[PDB]
Assembly symmetry: C2
Homo-oligomer: 152 residues x 2
Amino acid sequence: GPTSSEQIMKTGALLLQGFIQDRAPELALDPVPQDASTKKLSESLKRIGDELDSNMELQRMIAAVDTDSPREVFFRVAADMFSDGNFNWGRVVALFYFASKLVLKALSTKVPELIRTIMGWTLDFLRERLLGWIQDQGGWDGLLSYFGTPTW
Amino acid sequence: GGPTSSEQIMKTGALLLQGFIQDRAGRDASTKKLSESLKRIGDELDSNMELQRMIAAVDTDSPREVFFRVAADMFSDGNFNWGRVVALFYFASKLVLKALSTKVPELIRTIMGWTLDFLRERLLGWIQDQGGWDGLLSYFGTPTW
Ligand SMILES: [Pr+3]
Ligand SMILES: [Pr+3]
């Protein structure tokens, strides 16, 4: 049934997933259905969502402190969106919009940070194990004439 | 400061490595030429089955526990060549892509989890009363608070 909690939850997840994906990626979930019904809903989501880019009440409500563990932010802000006991479709879509901004925010720190720590380990190993050898070769320009395949 | 100066070598290594990782994640003059040879050797390594096995036999999902051991292992015979130097950059890059392909979907799924959880607690009832999701097609307002 269209009003059964099972269809509402199933559809809501499909809609949320597709909405986050468009605004940002293999989630290994159920794939978003391409039938007409779902398509109509996804397009309605996009139109209301796009309009929320210039909704500054929402931008204010959603603006977070640098580090505060996304979990803290999320529940407080979401309750805040609904704390007067009112509901409408706009606030529901605002909830999806907020989740999407929170993904973006987390990724813009977690990803560079991840790249940095791994590059840190690598350049550190290079400095301590490989540097003298590279010096003895005359620097990095030796790379230009390497055509071998390494074995171990 | 000098092509053989450790300053210049580390500065160049940092740029090459960063650019290398950027290309793999996507899919000056002296430096661009280096970047190109590095891309070539990195591309050749994709079908270096010995390297490929070596990486396969390792738990790439726990990069912290594994990196220095494998790196040390690659040079454990005291020998050096440019291919092995590139293989280290290649390995690093693998760890990065492996982390991205796991942590990014996990991060997104966790946040979707909180959202759907909230929607179920707080909004499920209201949505039911709207007759379900199709109500969305009859909404042309904007929310205020
Ligand atoms: Pr060290
Ligand atoms: Pr709960």
